[PDB]
Amino acid sequence: MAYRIVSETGDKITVELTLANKNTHYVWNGWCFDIKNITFETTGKVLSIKYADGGEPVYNVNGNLVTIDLTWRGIFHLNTTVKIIIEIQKSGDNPYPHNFKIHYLRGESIIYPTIGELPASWKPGNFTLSDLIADPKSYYDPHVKPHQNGFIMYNPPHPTQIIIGLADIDYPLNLASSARMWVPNKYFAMGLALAYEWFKVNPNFLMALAAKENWGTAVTKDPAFKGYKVIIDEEEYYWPVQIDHPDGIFQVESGNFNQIKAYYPDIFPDTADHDDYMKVSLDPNDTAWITSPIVAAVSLTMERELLYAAVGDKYNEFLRLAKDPWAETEIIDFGYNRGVGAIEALKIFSDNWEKAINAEVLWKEFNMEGFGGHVPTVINITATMDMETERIYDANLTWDDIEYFFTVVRQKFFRPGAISDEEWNAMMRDVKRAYDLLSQHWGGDHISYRYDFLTILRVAMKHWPEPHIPRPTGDDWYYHARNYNP
Amino acid sequence: AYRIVSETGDKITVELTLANKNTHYVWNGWCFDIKNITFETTGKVLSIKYADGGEPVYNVNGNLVTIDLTWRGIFHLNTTVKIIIEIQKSGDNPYPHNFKIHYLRGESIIYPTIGELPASWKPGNFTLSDLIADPKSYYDPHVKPHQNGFIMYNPPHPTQIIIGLADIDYPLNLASSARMWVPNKYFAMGLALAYEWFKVNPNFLMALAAKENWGTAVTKDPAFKGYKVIIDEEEYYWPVQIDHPDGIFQVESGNFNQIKAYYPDIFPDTADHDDYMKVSLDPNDTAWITSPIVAAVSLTMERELLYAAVGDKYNEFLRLAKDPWAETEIIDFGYNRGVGAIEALKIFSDNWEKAINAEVLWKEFNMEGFGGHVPTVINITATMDMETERIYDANLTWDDIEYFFTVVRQKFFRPGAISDEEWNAMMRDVKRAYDLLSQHWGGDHISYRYDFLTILRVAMKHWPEPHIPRPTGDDWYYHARNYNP
């Protein structure tokens, strides 16, 4: 930050720390800053730490390190400035305040595993086909490799492919005899893939979640479950989805929607509406079909973010000490069904750490059954879709479909100022190039969703404001996250 | 709720349980914001800590101890915080006592009562004398002048609505002259609702709308070309932009959402900016009723904010300010520019003397606004206040009243504030009132000016009290606490 020695007289040193938000107009990940604390080092004796405009923040000294807390003052909107004055009595080899480190109210060691990248040879504007594909052999390799990923894809099955295992379910889903995973339309798969590349969220998990919450991504041969007749490979199936539900296929309540709307200003514009973004229709042209998955993912992501803000490094520590290989998925799903308050009540990272890290099956030992066996159902369907090597979902995409998709993305997400008109148009030109380039493999009439859409997405994301995942901020966020004691 | 956990030796350990008891939503109990908790003792405070780890900030001034929760001071539904206090026994009264929770709201906020129904009034079956205290004053035409700005401290008449449709002999939005008139009667119903509910002078809302969007004023000036309005065989031009989504009060969506978050008791979650604010040429549009109230709320919010930041001193200023229109100036200026402008002026802080000594507040502080906003609004308000010649009046059928209250139920409040039984019986009492004081006019209509305050009060005999809820929530706490005017 910006500090300055105001005066050194006698043995006391007076330093002015200017903490401020510089931005006047909205910028990416700079609309509002939330500061948990400000740490600095000194060997001298701290006399007093006060605000310049009256009052003093709460601080405490542990050896060489001093931690300053802003408490209720820690909210920095646009064009906000707070000056802090520090007095120190000169002592030791290094008495002057130094090594200032502002700790934002966010997971300092949060983990978002990279799925894959474009070749370093890739350039904006005019690129070649070899600048899109690192290795055509693996890029078109059909062979399906099994994986055991839950909510977050730490270890991707393939860096450039989309493995959505449309597996058959041999165990009860919503009290059914059996079930079969299928995708309603391709635009929803585009949404799943966008959430996958952007937020590193396993699409199979969103499939399981939607299927459990509203039969959104699953059908069954069970006669009791009567609904829309879906034909797959000369086989009649019943789709008991409630397509008229305003909470969408992910069952997102309006309260949660508005809350995560306030949490992420960089993602959700002010004109956003619950029913518009979530409630889908039988018509695949509905915008919601694309917006519904991402939003859900965001919500899920939010929960994770929250934990990273409350537990910090310890979170990651748990990940290497937990015997249950599905623990994170369990916690996140359970928190999605019940609420973050349920997670806070479980107190895994607090009072009940030992039982948590020692239990081989986390969701059984904590009696977190959810609503009608929610957690185990979601986990099981996710794992089953992960193990599927026989049949993987694929789709054909025309250019107008891509245009439609990105137009929808521009219309429903982001905020004026994040991406101006120029480089967005240029972005669409680069996506045009990419499309026409790797469509020559299929005959220039279509591109493969599974094989190509990750590449398309990455080409499109070469222009997206980085860091790609913005920090959840704002008023509500600060105090809902700071009060969080899991 | 405090309790002596243990007294051992000379140290006393007390457990203070601070919590929100409500699980389902209730009126003015959805969220509690606590600035501080004060208690008295003569002993020596050893330590004040939270039960779940950490300690709040406190300080002792003699017998009084002030506890501050800071970032912990937000209490949503079903939230509980336990605080442990240790005190060393000393003096005549050592035990913690006289606990006083100071909510983050004006402790001495002033909302002057305009008038009341007779104490003889009962729910269900009442008489005509239970509605009218004195028929003489109740139907007295004679118009008494007044000098009220934003808040009606001294009402001209307790049961009447004096909307002075006066002629303006000075420039409003660069016009040669202007004439105040009401678009439709439903908007007047809205103005009156804001008047009885939030104690806001309807003339002020008239001036505000007129200045912001020509919403309540017409002119004979030829340059100002627009919709032709005929009043008493006289052609007038109405240069209102009826297609503006910000409504006739020019309320930006940001402000709308902010005050939407500030008042959970007033605005439901499904509320939309364009739906509530943007009106149309058709008087049947719901916005025509919702637009004034909302605006008033916004205005009220500003005032509330000051009451939270300055407290008693606010009222003190009211009796020390030489300018009799100071509050109106500050509120209007804050509405045009923003509360940040008021915070920047620092009247109650660094520049108190010049503020209370200046006879004309808005001239000495150079707060001209946008194109002379403040003085225009003040002048139009005062002119409408001085008007005794011609007062606005309207005729109301029962279906109009039904429409009004249905709109109110649909657009405002929150599920749980007023149950169905409560509303249905209320509407029956309003039916009774209507039919009762319609017998004076022939049972075909009721007078807006003379009767609608009575109707409103009859309807408000069932409304959840206190009628004006406290602005609360996350945004409110820290936007109000950071406020240093």
Ligand SMILES: [Co+2]
């Ligand atoms: Co604990």
Ligand SMILES: [Co+2]
């Ligand atoms: Co083909």
Ligand SMILES: [Co+2]
């Ligand atoms: Co990138």
Ligand SMILES: [Co+2]
């Ligand atoms: Co804020």
Ligand SMILES: [Co+2]
């Ligand atoms: Co000051």
Ligand SMILES: [Co+2]
């Ligand atoms: Co009452």
Ligand SMILES: [Co+2]
């Ligand atoms: Co909150």
